[PDB]
């Protein structure tokens, strides 16, 4: 005689990133093995009734994380790498100028004058030489 | 005699990224193995009644993550890489200018003058030489 | 005698990205293996009654993630890569200018003057030489 | 004697991306293996009654993710890559100018003057040389 | 004696992208294997009663994801690639100009003057040379 009663009430299970081998990153450079590994986990969750007898569940399991990293020649030369710019502003708030007078002679008013040339990146590669064999 | 009763009430199961080997990233450079791994997990979830006997579930499992990384020649030369620009603004809020007078002589008013030349990227590659064999 | 009762109530199962090997990324560069892996997972979910006997479920499973990365020659030279621009604005809000007078002589008013030349990308490739064998 | 009762109530199952090997990404560069993997998962979901006996379900399964990456020669030279532009605006809101007077002589008013030359991309490839064998 | 009762109530099953190997992406460059993998999954869903005995379901399954990537020669030279433009506007809202007077002499009013030359793409390929063997 075997009786199994299962009455869960509002089982709320949330799983965002369980065993996902996800590579979410910016690679601006290079010559690099990114996320060479895998995901071989067993996030077991048990909540109900169980009953087992005279069995053979698992045996001779083999999960070797064998990584062979043998880069022979790798060259990264004369490189200019820039990743991010964030919130680069130039503000002139409430710029008030009053030039009053009588029988005067205004000559030159330049409220701005070449205030900025470059803001984020001015990457230059001038007369750069590289030799190999 | 075997009896199995199963009465779940509102089982809310949410699964966003369980075992998805997802490569979601920007690769501005190169010569790099991106997301070479896989996903071989077993996110087991059990909530109901179970009953087993005299069985042979699993055996001789083999999950070796064997990665062979052998890049022979890799060259990244004379490179200018830029990834992101975010919120690059130049603001002139409430610019008030009053030029009053009587029998005067205004000559030159330049409220702006070549304020910016470049903002994000001015990538130049001038007279760059590379030699190989 | 075997009895199995199954009365689930409002089973809400949501699955967005379970085991999908999805490559969702921007590759502006190159010469890189993107998302070389696969998805071989078993996200098992059990909620009902189970009953098994004298069986042979799985055996001799082989899931080796064997990745062979052997790039012989890879060249990335004289490259100018730019990925993103976001919200690049130049604003002139509430620009008020009053030029009053009597028997005066206005000569030159230039409220703008070549304020910007380039904004996002000015990628130049001038007199760049590359030699190979 | 075997009895199986199955009375689910409002089973709402939602599945957006289960095991779809979907490559959804922009490849502006090149010479790169994009989404070389597959999808061979078993997202098993069980909710009803089960009853099995004296069977042979699975055996001798072989799911090796064997990827052979052997690019011999790959060249990416003298390249100018740009991906995205977003919300590039130049605004002049509420530009009010009053030029009053009596017996005056206005000469030149230029409220705009070549404010921008290029906005997103000015990709130039001038006198670029490449030699191979 | 075998009895099977099946009375589901409002089974709402939604499946958007289950196991579809769909390649939905823009390839502006080239020389790249896009979505070389397949979809060989088994998203099994069970909700009804089951009863089996003395069977042989599956055996000797072989699902190797064997990908052979052997590009011999690949050249991408002197390329200018641009992907997207989004919301590139130039606005002049509420531009009010009052030029009043008595016995005056207006000479030149140019409310606009060659404000923009190019907006999105000015891809130039001038005097670019390439040699091969």
Residue numbers in the entry:
A (entry chain E), B (entry chain B), C (entry chain A), D (entry chain C), E (entry chain D): 94 to 226
What does the paper say about this structure?
The normal cellular form of PrP (PrPC) typically exists as a glycosylated, glycophosphatidylinositol (GPI)- linked, membrane bound monomer with a largely α-helical C- terminal domain and disordered N- terminal domain. In contrast, PrPSc is multimeric and when purified, at least, usually takes the form of amyloid fibrils with ordered cores that are high in intermolecular β-sheets and loop structures. This aggregated form of PrP is able to grow by refolding PrPC and incorporating it into an ordered, transmissible assembly. Prion strains are infectious isolates that when transmitted to a given type of host exhibit characteristic clinical phenotypes, neuropathological lesions, survival times, and PrP deposition patterns.
